[PDB]
Design an enzyme around this catalytic site. Structure first.
Site, PDB file in Angstrom:
ATOM      1  N   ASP B  10     -26.175   4.210  24.792  1.00 50.80           N
ATOM      2  CA  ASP B  10     -25.766   5.393  24.037  1.00 50.80           C
ATOM      3  C   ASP B  10     -24.399   5.275  23.373  1.00 50.80           C
ATOM      4  O   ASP B  10     -23.731   6.289  23.151  1.00 50.80           O
ATOM      5  CB  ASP B  10     -25.877   6.683  24.868  1.00 50.80           C
ATOM      6  CG  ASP B  10     -24.867   6.756  25.988  1.00 50.80           C
ATOM      7  OD1 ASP B  10     -24.294   5.711  26.335  1.00 50.80           O
ATOM      8  OD2 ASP B  10     -24.656   7.873  26.519  1.00 50.80           O
ATOM      9  N   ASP B  15     -20.753   0.736  26.683  1.00 46.71           N
ATOM     10  CA  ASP B  15     -22.078   0.296  26.221  1.00 46.71           C
ATOM     11  C   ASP B  15     -21.935  -0.929  25.354  1.00 46.71           C
ATOM     12  O   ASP B  15     -22.750  -1.848  25.419  1.00 46.71           O
ATOM     13  CB  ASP B  15     -22.774   1.373  25.388  1.00 46.71           C
ATOM     14  CG  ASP B  15     -23.056   2.627  26.188  1.00 46.71           C
ATOM     15  OD1 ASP B  15     -24.175   2.821  26.697  1.00 46.71           O
ATOM     16  OD2 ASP B  15     -22.140   3.448  26.315  1.00 46.71           O
ATOM     17  N   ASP B  40     -23.898   9.844  24.408  1.00 44.61           N
ATOM     18  CA  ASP B  40     -22.430   9.726  24.352  1.00 44.61           C
ATOM     19  C   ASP B  40     -21.947   9.033  23.071  1.00 44.61           C
ATOM     20  O   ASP B  40     -20.984   8.265  23.082  1.00 44.61           O
ATOM     21  CB  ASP B  40     -21.856   9.089  25.612  1.00 44.61           C
ATOM     22  CG  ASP B  40     -20.405   9.482  25.859  1.00 44.61           C
ATOM     23  OD1 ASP B  40     -19.859  10.327  25.113  1.00 44.61           O
ATOM     24  OD2 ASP B  40     -19.809   8.918  26.801  1.00 44.61           O
ATOM     25  N   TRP B  83     -15.907  12.868  23.359  1.00 47.77           N
ATOM     26  CA  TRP B  83     -16.210  11.519  23.834  1.00 47.77           C
ATOM     27  C   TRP B  83     -17.179  10.807  22.890  1.00 47.77           C
ATOM     28  O   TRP B  83     -17.232   9.574  22.848  1.00 47.77           O
ATOM     29  CB  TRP B  83     -16.832  11.555  25.234  1.00 47.77           C
ATOM     30  CG  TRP B  83     -16.068  12.327  26.288  1.00 47.77           C
ATOM     31  CD1 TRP B  83     -14.784  12.804  26.211  1.00 47.77           C
ATOM     32  CD2 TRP B  83     -16.543  12.669  27.595  1.00 47.77           C
ATOM     33  NE1 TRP B  83     -14.444  13.441  27.384  1.00 47.77           N
ATOM     34  CE2 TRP B  83     -15.504  13.371  28.250  1.00 47.77           C
ATOM     35  CE3 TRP B  83     -17.748  12.456  28.277  1.00 47.77           C
ATOM     36  CZ2 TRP B  83     -15.636  13.863  29.557  1.00 47.77           C
ATOM     37  CZ3 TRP B  83     -17.882  12.951  29.573  1.00 47.77           C
ATOM     38  CH2 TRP B  83     -16.831  13.644  30.198  1.00 47.77           C
ATOM     39  N   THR B 137     -28.008   1.906  29.820  1.00 47.72           N
ATOM     40  CA  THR B 137     -26.605   2.259  29.964  1.00 47.72           C
ATOM     41  C   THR B 137     -26.312   3.640  29.396  1.00 47.72           C
ATOM     42  O   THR B 137     -25.172   4.093  29.431  1.00 47.72           O
ATOM     43  CB  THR B 137     -25.690   1.200  29.323  1.00 47.72           C
ATOM     44  OG1 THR B 137     -25.968   1.116  27.928  1.00 47.72           O
ATOM     45  CG2 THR B 137     -25.897  -0.190  29.932  1.00 47.72           C
ATOM     46  N   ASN B 186     -24.923  10.483  32.768  1.00 49.31           N
ATOM     47  CA  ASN B 186     -26.158   9.905  32.206  1.00 49.31           C
ATOM     48  C   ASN B 186     -27.399  10.601  32.730  1.00 49.31           C
ATOM     49  O   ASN B 186     -28.376  10.772  32.006  1.00 49.31           O
ATOM     50  CB  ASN B 186     -26.243   8.414  32.528  1.00 49.31           C
ATOM     51  CG  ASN B 186     -25.293   7.578  31.672  1.00 49.31           C
ATOM     52  OD1 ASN B 186     -24.627   8.108  30.786  1.00 49.31           O
ATOM     53  ND2 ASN B 186     -25.243   6.280  31.922  1.00 49.31           N
ATOM     54  N   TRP B 250     -18.179   1.023  33.772  1.00 48.61           N
ATOM     55  CA  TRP B 250     -19.530   1.421  34.192  1.00 48.61           C
ATOM     56  C   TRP B 250     -20.651   0.547  33.645  1.00 48.61           C
ATOM     57  O   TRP B 250     -21.299  -0.182  34.387  1.00 48.61           O
ATOM     58  CB  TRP B 250     -19.832   2.873  33.785  1.00 48.61           C
ATOM     59  CG  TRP B 250     -18.810   3.944  34.120  1.00 48.61           C
ATOM     60  CD1 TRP B 250     -18.739   4.678  35.270  1.00 48.61           C
ATOM     61  CD2 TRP B 250     -17.789   4.463  33.252  1.00 48.61           C
ATOM     62  NE1 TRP B 250     -17.712   5.602  35.185  1.00 48.61           N
ATOM     63  CE2 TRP B 250     -17.119   5.489  33.957  1.00 48.61           C
ATOM     64  CE3 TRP B 250     -17.364   4.151  31.950  1.00 48.61           C
ATOM     65  CZ2 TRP B 250     -16.036   6.203  33.411  1.00 48.61           C
ATOM     66  CZ3 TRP B 250     -16.288   4.868  31.403  1.00 48.61           C
ATOM     67  CH2 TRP B 250     -15.634   5.875  32.142  1.00 48.61           C
ATOM     68  N   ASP B 251     -20.886   0.632  32.339  1.00 53.95           N
ATOM     69  CA  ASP B 251     -22.042  -0.042  31.758  1.00 53.95           C
ATOM     70  C   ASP B 251     -21.885  -1.548  31.746  1.00 53.95           C
ATOM     71  O   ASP B 251     -22.874  -2.280  31.802  1.00 53.95           O
ATOM     72  CB  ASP B 251     -22.256   0.425  30.328  1.00 53.95           C
ATOM     73  CG  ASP B 251     -22.536   1.897  30.233  1.00 53.95           C
ATOM     74  OD1 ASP B 251     -22.844   2.502  31.292  1.00 53.95           O
ATOM     75  OD2 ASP B 251     -22.486   2.429  29.092  1.00 53.95           O
TER      76      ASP B 251
HETATM   77  O1  LIG Z   1     -15.347  10.104  31.191  1.00 56.75           O
HETATM   78  C1  LIG Z   1     -16.573   9.979  31.259  1.00 56.75           C
HETATM   79  N1  LIG Z   1     -17.334  10.894  31.992  1.00 56.75           N
HETATM   80  C2  LIG Z   1     -18.726  10.730  32.049  1.00 56.75           C
HETATM   81  N2  LIG Z   1     -19.316   9.731  31.415  1.00 56.75           N
HETATM   82  C3  LIG Z   1     -18.609   8.837  30.705  1.00 56.75           C
HETATM   83  C4  LIG Z   1     -18.968   7.716  29.975  1.00 56.75           C
HETATM   84  C5  LIG Z   1     -20.419   7.201  29.796  1.00 56.75           C
HETATM   85  N3  LIG Z   1     -21.329   7.837  30.792  1.00 56.75           N
HETATM   86  C6  LIG Z   1     -21.618   6.865  31.864  1.00 56.75           C
HETATM   87  C7  LIG Z   1     -20.683   7.109  33.068  1.00 56.75           C
HETATM   88  O2  LIG Z   1     -20.897   8.443  33.549  1.00 56.75           O
HETATM   89  C8  LIG Z   1     -21.459   5.483  31.213  1.00 56.75           C
HETATM   90  O3  LIG Z   1     -22.752   5.037  30.733  1.00 56.75           O
HETATM   91  C9  LIG Z   1     -20.483   5.688  30.039  1.00 56.75           C
HETATM   92  O4  LIG Z   1     -20.948   5.036  28.825  1.00 56.75           O
HETATM   93  C10 LIG Z   1     -17.863   7.179  29.452  1.00 56.75           C
HETATM   94  N4  LIG Z   1     -16.809   7.915  29.842  1.00 56.75           N
HETATM   95  C11 LIG Z   1     -17.228   8.931  30.607  1.00 56.75           C
HETATM   96 CA   LIG Z   2     -23.167   4.610  28.246  1.00 54.91          CA
END
Ligand SMILES: O=c1[nH]cnc2c([C@@H]3N[C@H](CO)[C@@H](O)[C@H]3O)c[nH]c12
Ligand SMILES: [Ca+2]
Ligand SMILES: O=c1[nH]cnc2c([C@@H]3N[C@H](CO)[C@@H](O)[C@H]3O)c[nH]c12
Ligand SMILES: [Ca+2]
Ligand code: NA
Lengths: 316, 317
Positions: B10, B15, B40, B83, B137, B186, B250-251
């Site tokens: 995403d 990612d 995202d 974001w 991801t 996610n 994370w990803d």
């Molecule tokens: O600050 C955040 N809070 C929740 N999700 C994310 C993400 C995205 N969501 C996932 C981690 O929750 C991960 O796939 C990442 O691409 C990035 N930053 C944040």
């Molecule tokens: Ca992601």
């Protein structure tokens, strides 16, 4: 070339402004910089200033210059979300090339001796020829110099080219407590701005939102830096524009220092609202007799500016 | 030798680091496709950045071109707007806008525009000669759509799904007036689809939940090490993205496991997803249902191994 000091607050456009000033050595001798804890956290802004300076010094004929952290404190702090951008730049690969960080680690201690406000006063007053101050953060440091030294300082200023304010357009400070008439650099410290705009002994050029609003930073333009990836400055400037919003506020202001063809200017008597009211920080026309004039930029040459920056970013 | 992989992402910064890790490790991974979801990211930007990265890598390390699709999936609960703009930033980065690379993307973009990501995912998995690993991801909407449409005809062609999402024995990251903080984004974006995926009997799942990803922080000194490698396009790219990002990988950790499973040992857990509109909507919870399918949750990832893998991978070009 003319002597210039950059008085900045470490956001993305402040650094584009720095690159513009520093790269144009034919027109601009950049003799110093100071960083204020306004639209950055000052240690990150300081470090990014040093890293940019070192990158340029190692790759073109750009003399090292003093960099000072200002002791200025906020009246109204910038949003935390915007202040982190210098931290991001501090970690960028382009600013962390071995030869450049080696140099910065070596020369950092000398610059740590400076306090920005005193450094600004000293660089201006001790110069043989008059100094142009390019102010791209709040006006706290110029005001401090005026308050401490008065004419001893102002008589030595060629002109103060300021990014700030909003005269005949809306501001950009939109908070629950405000009416949207103020611009952020002024709002950060209204009293200091009032001192600067009302000082009869100071020549001022003002890049308010009236002019900056008309020069949008568009994606296809930013993408043109991708045509120049063999130039370090183009990776740098392109990266910072890519991370930024739709305006070139401080860069336009610095462009005028390089070449006044960037904009025509109109004299306007500018006062500042310092009261704790919804319009705190507004820059307003005043009718007061004999009130000092500020030369407000109008109808900037957008294409000329945009071309100037692309070319300047080929310096190294 | 290399195994077929599809990246279902995403379009946030991690990612794209994940994408670089998969694509750069050609000995282990044959990247046969990608899809972008409007989660995202604004999907057009995530699509363009995916194309631009692929084209850079094709021209500089001979990475074979592959289909890229945009998913029609819509949010149950959308990501914060603040974001989602990061792919837009990336789309304008100098490193991704070198003329030879952009000209290649311009040439192949229209064919990729025509795909719909959900059907693309189904087709790539089902039409592959060998089994396909799906690295997920973003949200689980696309894998769920394929299970719903094709069932065993799809799942039987999946080697495994390696999924970034959830939080099992640690709190989540979805913090709203209406939530209790136990859900991860996610999953929260589309709880029903996540439920379909985690409850599917036909399917091997590896799950990088916050339990594992919390333990691999991305810190400034490490990010600055990419500056030692500015002669490599991928180090400019990865370093820039980490410099722009938050505190975690994370990803990227999830993709690292696809490259080499020594990244983490795994623990079988029966995972259900809360889909009702309750404070923990989107939570991944242990279920006690008899014979419920197991999900292999990553535990105690090898942080140094990962950090080294990424620095090395970013020297591929
Ligand atoms: O600050 C955040 N809070 C929740 N999700 C994310 C993400 C995205 N969501 C996932 C981690 O929750 C991960 O796939 C990442 O691409 C990035 N930053 C944040
Ligand atoms: Ca992601
Ligand atoms: O949205 C923003 N992000 C980062 N900086 C600024 C500013 C800062 N204030 C000035 C423009 O109002 C300019 O000096 C810029 O550095 C205004 N708005 C933003
Ligand atoms: Ca500024
Ligand atoms: Na399109």
């Amino acid at each position: 070339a003319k002597n210039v000091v950059l008085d900045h607050d470490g956001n993305l456009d402040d650094f584009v402004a720095m690159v513009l000033l520093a790269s144009n050595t034919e027109k601009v001798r950049l003799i110093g910089a100071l960083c204020t804890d306004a639209d950055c956290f000052v240690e990150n802004g300081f470090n990014v200033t040093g890293k940019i300076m070192c990158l340029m010094h190692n790759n073109m004929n750009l003399p090292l210059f003093p960099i000072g952290k200002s002791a200025a404190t906020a009246v109204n702090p910038f949003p935390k979300e915007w202040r982190c951008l210098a931290k991001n730049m501090d970690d960028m690969p382009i600013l962390n090339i071995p030869e450049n960080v080696e140099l910065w680690d070596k020369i950092k201690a000398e610059n740590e001796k400076y306090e920005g406000q005193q450094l600004l006063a000293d660089l201006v007053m001790n110069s043989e020829e008059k100094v142009t101050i390019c102010v791209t953060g709040p006006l706290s440091n110029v005001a401090w110099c005026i308050d401490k030294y008065g004419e001893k300082f102002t008589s030595k200023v060629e002109e103060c080219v300021i990014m700030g304010g909003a005269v005949d357009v809306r501001g950009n400070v939109f908070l629950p407590s405000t009416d949207g008439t103020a611009e952020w650099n002024i709002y950060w410290d209204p009293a200091s701005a009032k001192t600067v705009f009302g000082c009869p002994g100071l020549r001022r050029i003002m890049f308010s939102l009236d002019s900056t609003n008309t020069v949008p930073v568009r994606s296809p333009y930013v993408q043109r830096f991708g045509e120049q990836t063999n130039f370090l400055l183009s990776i740098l400037v392109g990266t910072m524009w890519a991370m930024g919003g739709g305006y070139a506020w401080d860069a336009l202001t610095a462009a005028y220092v390089v070449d006044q063809k960037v904009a025509n200017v109109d004299p306007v008597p500018i006062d500042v609202v310092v009261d704790k009211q919804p319009n705190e920080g507004a820059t307003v026309r005043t009718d007061a007799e004999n009130y000092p004039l500020t030369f407000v930029a109008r109808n900037p040459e957008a294409e000329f500016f945009l071309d100037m920056l692309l070319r300047s970013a080929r310096a190294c």
